[PDB]
Structure formats: structure tokens, C-alpha cells
Amino acid sequence: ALVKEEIQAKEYLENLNKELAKRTNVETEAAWAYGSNITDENEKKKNEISAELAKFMKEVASDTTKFQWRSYQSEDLKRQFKALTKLGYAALPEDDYAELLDTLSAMESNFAKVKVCDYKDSTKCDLALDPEIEEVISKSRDHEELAYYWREFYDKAGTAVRSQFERYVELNTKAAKLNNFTSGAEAWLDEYEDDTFEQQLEDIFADIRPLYQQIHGYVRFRLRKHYGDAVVSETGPIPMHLLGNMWAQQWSEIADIVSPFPEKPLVDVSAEMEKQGYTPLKMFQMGDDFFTSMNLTKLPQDFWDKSIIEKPTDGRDLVCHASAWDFYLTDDVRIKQCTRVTQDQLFTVHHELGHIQYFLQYQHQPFVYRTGANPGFHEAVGDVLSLSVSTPKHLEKIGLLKDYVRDDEARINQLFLTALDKIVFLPFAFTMDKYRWSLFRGEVDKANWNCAFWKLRDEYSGIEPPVVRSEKDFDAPAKYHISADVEYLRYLVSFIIQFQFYKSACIKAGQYDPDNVELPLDNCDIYGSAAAGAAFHNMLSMGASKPWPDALEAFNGERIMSGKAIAEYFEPLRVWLEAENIKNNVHIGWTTSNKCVS
Ligand SMILES: *[C@@H]1O[C@H](CO)[C@@H](O[C@@H]2O[C@H](CO)[C@@H](O[C@@H]3O[C@H](CO[C@H]4O[C@H](CO)[C@@H](O)[C@H](O)[C@@H]4O)[C@@H](O)[C@H](O[C@H]4O[C@H](CO[C@@H]5O[C@H](CO)[C@@H](O)[C@H](O)[C@@H]5O)[C@@H](O)[C@H](O)[C@@H]4O)[C@@H]3O)[C@H](O)[C@H]2NC(C)=O)[C@H](O)[C@H]1NC(C)=O
Ligand SMILES: *[C@@H]1O[C@H](CO)[C@@H](O)[C@H](O)[C@H]1NC(C)=O
Ligand SMILES: *[C@@H]1O[C@H](CO)[C@@H](O)[C@H](O)[C@H]1NC(C)=O
Ligand SMILES: C[C@H](CS)C(=O)N1CCC[C@H]1C(=O)O
Ligand SMILES: [Zn+2]
């Protein structure tokens, strides 16, 4: 009978959760060892342990059928059982899972091992993306140099893994269907527990799209003045290599040439950080201080003892893309970051520490609940703090911004700078998953895979490659998350919801009042606010114990993902920018790109 079984089920779940945590700890250690030290031996070890855990997950999913869990009274017990039925890749046959693992590591290791030759010195061929190539992309204003590095990188990080990527799509699809999802798109979207989630994002994106068009138009205008009309056309998509980022996902690195008021201050604290003798250790210590200042949890000793916060100086290959790690014990949390002393890197430190804080806040939950309310929540935490860290208000407090006058023009410069990171990213993030969803769903024939990628980048972002690409090239895997099989919609969601969190945290901190000119949203600093911290504790401690609208409700009483907050933040910029574009007769929109030959 059901009453007695539900008691037994509760006991079954308690033990199983603890067992899953312990088994996952072993897989995580091997995955950490591989990411920190790419070798054939470490690859073998990572993939063999994963195969072993997958085998156990299969047994668990099979064992859930022995319980009448759908009949139970407790929503909590039913939710835990449901989490256990979802196998993901573990649903694949033993041999298929092993092949998928070998395929994934082949792609991630290819990306991590990419080396190019120096533009000026064809004998020096040991430039890696991080930091060598990225330094050039961000700093060089030589369009031919930029285009050289773009082509070299994309050819090696992208085209080189086409066949592996094809097999990955096949096995991802097979796995999804064994879980009775239509494709991997539906498997990923299941994490958001909302059958209208795609439409919700389309609607929010449509509301912000006109603002993006205005920013795009103004940036293109300013780039024409710098590079000339031979490099940048008035009516065409922007050549992406000019945007200060390898993937044109954020444009803040070219702020010095596109800033609204060039005679007024533009915040760039990198030089002051170096001047004051900042180190990676100091940057992480300052992030820790920000969290502890809000009455949130201090970084444990394991973090300091075990984290990797600088690129290793021996000859080893590693994954340098920044990552935060939960080892599912108590207080064993780690970051691996190839940290550099720059402003943007200071934001990245706070982003990664946001993941760490989430791990610490929910470590008391049963294993299945030790994850974000949805994947976007996990990405948003640290970015909320980064928004405060980026303010002139905060940067003056820590002595990184000196002799700053916050007049009307300086404010527009700062809002524009933020928008180059926050608004610009939205169409980029949407296209990363729109692309993969289309391949997962079988909507694009293999013969059209590369130009389907550039078509999307054109349609949504109005950017294009520096050189003509074709189906001989395969450019998508040149982005880390595509080579490493990391869902990207989490970042689009994050960039929307982080403004909901920021706005509410600021109101709570007494730092934002829409009717008080002295308290604008774009200069809010939540440092030292226990009130803002209280809201974070309330939400993060839930982990995934409840559907995400309940986690949002715990923070600020709202239950809906909304574009209201991000639009509110950038409203003063929108008004100024629309007028500035009219004043300067700026062309808005773009013709279809000619840079991908079918
Ligand atoms: C994805 O979707 C798949 C379907 O498209 C699904 O696969 C199905 O899972 C079913 C299990 O839930 C399974 O149903 C069983 O079928 C057995 C015989 O099927 C054979 O012949 C079929 C042709 O008709 C073939 O196509 C199959 O390949 C099989 O060879 C039955 O023998 C079996 O029955 C037993 O179990 C039921 C279930 O009992 C339930 O639980 C309690 C038990 O205490 C009951 O009180 C309760 O009422 C409830 O019914 C018993 O009632 C019964 O007495 C038997 O003991 C069972 O019906 C089905 O075969 C399978 N495939 C197909 C094609 O249908 C996947 O499971 C889905 N995957 C995921 C991850 O969700
Ligand atoms: C990297 O891994 C190899 C074996 O795969 C091991 O011998 C070596 O100690 C590791 N290197 C470092 C720097 O940890
Ligand atoms: C700090 O957090 C604790 C719980 O961690 C809470 O009980 C306490 O009220 C908070 N202190 C302040 C000043 O808000
Ligand atoms: C550094 C983090 C790791 S979770 C990251 O990958 N981000 C943060 C913003 C977007 C995305 C990217 O770099 O592509
Ligand atoms: Zn992240």
C-alpha cells in the first residue's frame, strides 16, 4: 500500500542522494584533473569514470519504476524522483556513450590546444587564444592583422573538428530520443520547466531588439570614421574582427573609439590595477570581500588551497576558459581561471565567485537539488555583483577610478559602455542555441551547416566574417561552449534576469529610487548591503528544490521572467541614442551578408 511505500521511498531517496554525491565527487575530480592538465592518460581516466557513473544512473532510473512515485502525496518526493528519471547521455548504450565521451574530449582538447603563428614572425608559432590572440583582438586597430588572427583561429578551432561535431550531433540526438525528447533542443529546454519558454524569450528579445539596432547603427557609424569606408560600409553588416572580441559577443574593448563623448571620462581601470600592483590573488580576495560584505558566505580554505587562479608556467596544455567547480562534499569548491590583471577580468572573477557562492548556499540540499533553480540563475548571481563593481561609485571607493566627474556626458559614456557588454550580447547568445537547436532538430541539411551559422549571426547581430567563408569551413566550434557542449541559453536568460535581481537588490539596499535623481539605477553599489544579501540567501539556499518562479518569488516576490528591468536600466541611453542617431543621420539596419558562399 501507498502510505507505507512513501515512507520507504523517503528513506530510499536520502541514501541515494548521498550515494550520488559521492560517486559524482569521483567523476568531478577526474574532470578537474583533465581540465587542469590535458593528457591522454587524464582523458582516459575522465572518460572511464564517467562511463561507470552512467552505468549506475541507468540502474537508478530503472529502480524508480519500482516505486509508485507519481501516486505520492509529497510534491518534494515526486520532484526528486522525477529528477532521477532524467538520464541525459547516460541513457545511451555502453558503447555509444563511450564514443560520445571520446568525441567530446576530442573537441574540447582541440580547442584548448589551438596555437597560431605570429603575424609579424612566422617562426614563432606558440600563440594561444588565452592570452596571446585575445590580447591582439582586443588591442590591435590594424584591420589586416585582426583579420589574419581571425582566420587562423577559426580554421584551427572550428573547421578542424567538423567530423567530430557531426558525430556529436548524431549521438546527442540519439540520447535525447532515448529519453523521449524530440531532440537535444527539447532536452536542454526541459531545465527551464516551462513549455512556453522559447516564445517568452522571443517576446523579450523583440522588445530589446530596437535598442540593439540603434547601438549597432551608431557603432558602425563610428567605425567608418576610424577605419574608412573601404573597411566598413554604411549599409552592410559590421566586419566582426573590428569589434574587439573573437566572436563579437561583447564590444566593450573598442569603447575608446566608439564612445559618445570622447573628451569626457571613459572608465578603464586596467592601468590603475597594474599601477597599484594588483595580483590574481588580490582580485579573488576582493571578490570574497564583496560577498562577505553582504553577509554572505566566506570562501572556505579548500578553495584557496586547491583553486588555480593563474595560467601555469610549465609546458602543459589545459582548458583556460574560466570555470567554477562543485565537488559535492562540504566546502570543496574550486575555480580554474587563467586570470589577468584587467578590468574585464575583475568582472569575470566576480562572475565565477557567483557560481561558488551558489554552491555554498545549497550544499545542505539533497544532491538532486544541488544545482541552480534554472541554468540562467547560476550565471546571473556573480553578474549582479559585477554590475555594482562596474559603477563609478564602487570603482572610486576602491581607488581604481580617480579624478572622475559624473556629469551628463560621462553618464552616457558609462551607460554606452555597459550596453556594449549587456545589450550587444543578447542577439549573440540567442543565436548560439538557435543554431544548435536547428541542427539537433534536423532542420538544416549537413551540406548547409556552416552558412546556416553565419545566416543567424547576420539576421540577429548584423555582423559577418572578415573574409569569405564557405561550406569548406566550419566555424561554430571556434566558440568554446560549442566545442565543449555547454548549453548557451543560460547566458541569454542570465542577462535578462540579472537586471531583475540587480534592480530589486538596489531597491532593498536603498540605492535605487526612480523618483530621486541622486539614486539612479546605473550608479547603484550593493557592497556592504545585508538587506540585498538576505534576498540572495533566501533564493540561493533553495537550489533546485522548487520550480524557478518560486526561487524568484523568494528573492523579490515576482514569478515572471521580464525584460522590464533591463529596459529600465538603459532607458536614459535609449533616449539619448535615438536622438543622436537622428542628429547624425545614422543608417539603421543592414543588407544580407555576402561572406558565406553556398
Ligand atoms: C519512452 O517511451 C516508450 C514508449 O514509446 C517507453 O517504452 C515502453 O515502456 C513501457 C514500460 O513503462 C513498456 O510497457 C511494458 O510492456 C511489456 C510488454 O511489451 C512488449 O511487447 C511490446 C508489443 O506490444 C513491444 O513493443 C515491447 O518491446 C515489449 O517487448 C509488458 O509486459 C509490461 O507489463 C508489465 O508492467 C506493467 C506496468 O505496471 C505499472 O506499475 C505497477 C506495477 O506494480 C502497476 O500496478 C501499474 O498499474 C502500472 O501499470 C504491469 O501492469 C503488468 O502487470 C506487467 O508486469 C509493460 O506494460 C513498453 O513495452 C515500452 N515500449 C513500448 C514500445 O511500448 C519508454 O519506457 C519511455 N522511456 C522513458 C525514459 O520514459
Ligand atoms: C599532468 O599529467 C601527467 C600524466 O598524465 C602527470 O604525470 C603530471 O604530473 C601532470 N602534470 C602536472 C603539472 O600536474
Ligand atoms: C547575517 O546572516 C545571518 C544568517 O546567515 C542572519 O541571521 C543575520 O540576521 C544577518 N545579519 C544581518 C546584520 O543582516
Ligand atoms: C566566463 C563564463 C564561464 S561560466 C562564461 O563562459 N561566460 C560569461 C558570459 C558569457 C560566457 C562567455 O564567455 O562566452
Ligand atoms: Zn558562468
Swiss-Prot record:
UniProt GO molecular function: carboxypeptidase activity; metal ion binding; metallopeptidase activity; peptidyl-dipeptidase activity
PROSITE patterns: PEPTIDASE_M2, ZINC_PROTEASE
Domain (Peptidase M2): residue spans on this chain: 3-591
The protein's Enzyme Commission number: 3.4.15.1
Subcellular location: Secreted, Extracellular space
Phenotype seen when the gene is deleted: Male flies are sterile.
Positions that bind Zn(2+): H351, H355, E379
Residues the record marks as active site: E352 (proton acceptor), H481 (proton donor)
Cofactor note: Binds 1 zinc ion per subunit.
Gene3D superfamilies from the UniProt entry: 1.10.1370.30
GO BP terms: metamorphosis; peptide hormone processing; proteolysis; response to symbiotic bacterium; sexual reproduction
InterPro entries for this protein: Peptidase_M2
Catalysed reactions, as listed in the record: Release of a C-terminal dipeptide, oligopeptide-|-Xaa-Yaa, when Xaa is not Pro, and Yaa is neither Asp nor Glu. Thus, conversion of angiotensin I to angiotensin II, with increase in vasoconstrictor activity, but no action on angiotensin II
Free-text tissue specificity from the UniProt record: Expressed in vesicular structures in spermatocytes and early spermatids (at protein level).
Gene Ontology annotations for the cellular component aspect, listed alphabetically: extracellular space; plasma membrane
One Pfam family in the UniProt entry: Peptidase_M2
Post-translation changes: Glycosylated.
Glycosylation sites: N37, N180, N295
Cysteines engaged in disulfide bonds, as pairs: C117-C125, C320-C338, C506-C524
Transmembrane domains' residue ranges: none
Regulation of this protein's activity per its record: Inhibited by captopril and, to a lesser extent, by lisinopril, trandolaprilat, fosinoprilat and enalaprilat.
Keywords recorded for this protein, A-Z: Carboxypeptidase, Disulfide bond, Glycoprotein, Hydrolase, Metal-binding, Metalloprotease, Protease, Secreted, Signal, Zinc
Cofactor(s) the protein requires to work: Zn(2+)
Family affiliation: Belongs to the peptidase M2 family.
Physiological role: May be involved in the specific maturation or degradation of a number of bioactive peptides. May play a role in the contractions of the heart, gut and testes, and in spermatid differentiation.
Protein name listed in UniProt: Angiotensin-converting enzyme
Organism of provenance: Drosophila melanogaster
Gene from which this protein is expressed: Ance
